[PDB]
Amino acid sequence: EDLPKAVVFLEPQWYSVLEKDSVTLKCQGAYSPEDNSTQWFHNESLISSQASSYFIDAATVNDSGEYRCQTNLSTLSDPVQLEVHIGWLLLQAPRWVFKEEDPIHLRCHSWKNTALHKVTYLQNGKDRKYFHHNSDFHIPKATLKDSGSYFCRGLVGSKNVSSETVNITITQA
């Protein structure tokens, strides 16, 4: 009989971002006629008390952590993690655990106002996909063979750069 708790969503979906990236935290919840305020929390600290969304214009490493929201009808949400990194490239995914059959969208994100070319996405040290100009790598339907350590690399100007690795787990069922 108890109403659903609030839910936090990130737009875009990437849980890890680079400093200077913009992130919008959205709160899915219900409001009563006399109180439509939304409360946002960053690691247990209150950060906002009215708007349904919390917009981070230019992320900093200090923004990393757990975020939760709530309304006066939808209770405290489970936490959503945001990781903020510093580097020329970042391999992004909407999550790090996928079920077999699931599509996997990876993005080799370059730092604000830089452009990457000759990009390769690698899995367990082996090339999985190459693009002459930076593009995303979509794995149609995940199999157990997709579990592993992923990273991407390419060129920004004449500088060879490589992202940190991201470990992806595929669960059965």
- C-beta of 15 vs 31, nearer to Hg ion: 15
What tokens does 15 get? Answer: 């849980």
Residues 173, 123: Cα–Cα separation, whole Å: 23
Least distance from Hg ion to the Cβ atom of residue 135, Å: 13
Among residues 59 and 161, whose Cβ is nearest to Hg ion? 59
**DSSP state for residue 163 in the 8-state scheme:** P
| Cβ nearer to Hg ion, comparing 42 with 161 | 42
For residues 135 and 37, give the distance between their C-alpha atoms in angstroms, rounded to a whole number. Answer: 39
Query: What residue ranges bind Hg ion (CB under 5 A)?
Result: 42, 105
Nearest in space to 28 (alpha carbons), one of 87, 68, 60, 86 = 68
Least spacing, CB of residue 159 vs Hg ion, in Å: 28
In whole angstroms, how close is the CB of 86 to Hg ion at the nearest point? 18
